[PDB]
Swiss-Prot record:
Residues 106-127 are annotated as: Disordered. The gene is rps11. This is Small ribosomal subunit protein uS11. Disulfide bonds: none annotated. It comes from Pyrococcus abyssi (strain GE5 / Orsay). It comes from the Archaea. InterPro entries: Ribosomal_uS11, Ribosomal_uS11_archaeal, Ribosomal_uS11_CS, Ribosomal_uS11_sf.
Amino acid sequence: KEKWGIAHIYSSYNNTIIHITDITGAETISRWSGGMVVKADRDEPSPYAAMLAARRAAEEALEKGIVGVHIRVRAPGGSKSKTPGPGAQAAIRALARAGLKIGRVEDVTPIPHDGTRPKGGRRGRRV
RNA sequence: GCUCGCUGGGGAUACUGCGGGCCUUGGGACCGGGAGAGGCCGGGGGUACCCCCGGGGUAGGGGUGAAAUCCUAUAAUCCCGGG
Ligand SMILES: [Mg+2]
Ligand SMILES: [Mg+2]
Ligand SMILES: [Mg+2]
Ligand SMILES: [Mg+2]
């Protein structure tokens, strides 16, 4: 038939993580981050690092029989920033280029209905 | 003229004071259909977050203007099932 999986993309201002699981999520097919493809901390969240990691993960997934994925992309969320970093969309485009079919795309950033207090004080970072 | 102050009497009744009568306009009481994150007490929920147990997977995660302390093979970051 068609073996379909899920691509979980975690994108912040400091790094990017691309993690492919099966359709239920309980089994890990492949997992690559920005620090595994570059040597400098400054380049970890760049679009090019996201492309490289997505390509490695997609190749490992294709060798094992995955044909397509559905995509779940998230920023850190909670009491941290709600906006994804610059690597998410580059990672999305690279998966399709490497040979995977793409299903539905959704954002799953966790959002509180008035949760906890964030760091920094009532004055924030002072730079 | 000044010591603008005191005292014996006579007259007036507009205003203020005091006594009696009569009002409803200010204020208060009550009745009707509605408005509101006003207050107190009891019950039922919402996501988010932290810790613990079990499954997967394996070398990094976190963080800055740039780094380091810190966390991680006693298996982290990430994903799934529960408390
Ligand atoms: Mg790193
Ligand atoms: Mg501090
Ligand atoms: Mg300064
Ligand atoms: Mg485990």
